[PDB]
Write a protein that binds this DNA or RNA. Structure first.
Length: 72
DNA sequence: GCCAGCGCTGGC
DNA sequence: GCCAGCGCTGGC
C-alpha cells in the first residue's frame, strides 16, 4: 504493498510526474488514486483537467490516465 | 479558506 | 456492476 509512489512519467514532457496514492480507509480502501504533477508542482486528478494544459503541446488521445502510458 | 481523502453517479 | 470524473467536507 500500500505504498505511495511518485516519480517522472515518461509518457509526458520533461519534469511531469505521476503519483499513485492507495486509499487507507472507508468503502474504497485499497483503491489507488492517480495524480499527475506539472514541472511547477500543480496537481492534476483527471484526464480532462490534464488535457487543458498538455492537449495542445502533445497528443493525449491514446494516453491512459490510469496507467500513465500511451496505448500501443 | 484550503485540500487530502473519501463517496456519488452518469455513462457505459 | 464498474469506474472516470469530480463534489464535498473534516480537520487543519
Amino acid at each position: 504493498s500500500m505504498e505511495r509512489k511518485r516519480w517522472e512519467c515518461p509518457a509526458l514532457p520533461q519534469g511531469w510526474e505521476r503519483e499513485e496514492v492507495p486509499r487507507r480507509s472507508g468503502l474504497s480502501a485499497g483503491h489507488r488514486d492517480v495524480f499527475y504533477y506539472s514541472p511547477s508542482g500543480k496537481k492534476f486528478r483527471s484526464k480532462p483537467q490534464l488535457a487543458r494544459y498538455l492537449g495542445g503541446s502533445m497528443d493525449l488521445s491514446t494516453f491512459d490516465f490510469r496507467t500513465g502510458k500511451m496505448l500501443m
